[PDB]
Amino acid sequence: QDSLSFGFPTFPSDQKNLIFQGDAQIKNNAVQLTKTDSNGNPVASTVGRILFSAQVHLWEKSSSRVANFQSQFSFSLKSPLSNGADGIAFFIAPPDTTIPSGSGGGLLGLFAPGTAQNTSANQVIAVEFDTFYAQDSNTWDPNYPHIGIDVNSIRSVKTVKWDRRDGQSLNVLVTFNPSTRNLDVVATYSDGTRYEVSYEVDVRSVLPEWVRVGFSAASGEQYQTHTLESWSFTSTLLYTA
Amino acid sequence: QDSLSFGFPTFPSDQKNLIFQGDAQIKNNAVQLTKTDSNGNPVASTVGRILFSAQVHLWEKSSSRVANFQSQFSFSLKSPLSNGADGIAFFIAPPDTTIPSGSGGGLLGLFAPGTAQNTSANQVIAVEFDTFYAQDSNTWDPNYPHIGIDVNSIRSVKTVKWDRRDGQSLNVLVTFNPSTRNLDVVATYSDGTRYEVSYEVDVRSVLPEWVRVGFSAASGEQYQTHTLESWSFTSTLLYTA
Ligand SMILES: CO[C@H]1O[C@H](CO)[C@@H](O[C@H]2O[C@H](CO)[C@@H](O)[C@H](O)[C@@H]2O)[C@H](O)[C@@H]1O
Ligand SMILES: CO[C@H]1O[C@H](CO)[C@@H](O[C@H]2O[C@H](CO)[C@@H](O)[C@H](O)[C@@H]2O)[C@H](O)[C@@H]1O
Ligand SMILES: [Ca+2]
Ligand SMILES: [Ca+2]
Ligand SMILES: [Mn+2]
Ligand SMILES: [Mn+2]
Secondary structure: EEEEEEEEEOOOOOOOEEEEEOEEEEEEEEEOOOOEOOOOOOOOOEEEEEEEEOOEEEEOOOOOOOEEEEEEEEEEOOOOOOOOOOOOEEEEOOOOOOOOOOOOOOOOOOOOOHHHHOHOOOEEEEEEEEEEOOOOOOOOOOOEEEEEEEEEEOOOOEEEEOOOOOOOEEEEEEEEEOOOOOOEEEEEEEOOOOOEEEEEOOOOOOOOOOEEEEEEEEEEEOOEEEEEEEEEEEEEEEEOO | OEEEEEEOOOOOOOOOOOEEOOOEEEEEOOEEEOEOOOOOEEEEOOOEEEEEEEOOEEEOOOEEEEEEEEEEEEEEEEEEOOOOOOOEEEEEEOOOOOOOOOOHHOOOOOOOOOHOOOOOOOOOOEEEEEEOOOOOOOOOOOOEEEEHHHHHHHHEEEEEEEOOOOOEEEEEEEEEEEOOEEEEEEEEEEOEEEEEEEEEEOOOOOOOOOEEEEEEEEEEOOOOOOEEEEEEEEEEEEOOO
């Protein structure tokens, strides 16, 4: 299809079009990306991701078209600790993507240790909401919580300082304009606090024509729940000249 | 997802989200449901169907909601014979639906011979464009080409007279309103000729909560091509009160 869209206002337990990887699962009409105990408390050493089953036609060589897409979603993080880790990320990657070996903790379940910073060894674009930046383990991170755009590397090509609020839902809008090649991110808390970050990227030189979209989250030594509450997505192939 | 939609203005050969069954395949940016030779000419004894891979949430018991959906599509039929057969149908059925054994010819690849007219043995709703009605073989058909609404049986719950035009595209709009429970069908040729037919049906007593949508076509002794040229679909769960 040239166009595709879907919307999950909530996440009822009987899902049919979601690919669950790692510890991801549905609980209380929301997606708990990371593992929790019987009491609903976050645990350490856990990774989880979800992908929509239908593949997205991001670009088409024969027609020289590139898709214009928008992803809207909300999530919340909760943790008895004040150093919650490690973060949640919206990502786009080849359809057969799986959790790389040893991609836990600060690698957010998206990159392999040995090539986490090798841009020519990866095929992924992601928008991370990173809450852990200890310079000893996350050497690639700026020294403060942040939202970043990742293009084939765990070291963001661009970031903006961000504030983690325990238990509060963050509303996010991610848009890609093929005409300008700008990937824009806008995140806001219910009180109006707003954060923005953008970057110009030619998706054609990074990802294949067909991809899958989803979310990933992970907790290493430090932990917190990564609860995905809602999500809607839409993409349309457009002639851009 | 509570809502889902997709659009195929045309059908390029590299598809990822279509399930092809039988002889269906892509040729010249269109879906040829029935088999054709090297010259693109129709042949006898062929059946083929396609289904969109993502499952559609038709209704939800827990929330008492039922989907509002619309399917717009166009096709063309072509044959050197004076009596091209057998027809093409848009249908909705359980996710695991496959071509029934011996469902060729007048059964349109939708029903098995032994239970073709047993409404309690089937789970399918289809809109057929039936071009073959010989009273000696298709005993269940009215005596003329027609558009029919099928509910668990090859013997339409309703039919209206229709004209077959060789090589001319027919545009069709199929909609379902959960509020009135009306399944409406509107078909037109490029010169303005119009056909309409509707039927009241509670989809909840006929189909499971999750289903797949697609098209089916077949040719028995007589033949013709069944070319699907375009298709767009959309559905959204709504509270029915
Ligand atoms: C000195 O490193 C120790 O402590 C690190 C952080 O406490 C730890 O890193 C793990 O946990 C963090 C936070 O969850 C995560 O970002 C890392 O990727 C890693 O999983 C080290 O392993 C040591 O214990
Ligand atoms: C009396 O029946 C004979 O002729 C029928 C029509 O030619 C034929 O039926 C087959 O073909 C029709 C048309 O394609 C189709 O509707 C039937 O389902 C069947 O496949 C009979 O087989 C006999 O030859
Ligand atoms: Ca980090
Ligand atoms: Ca018939
Ligand atoms: Mn980071
Ligand atoms: Mn009929």
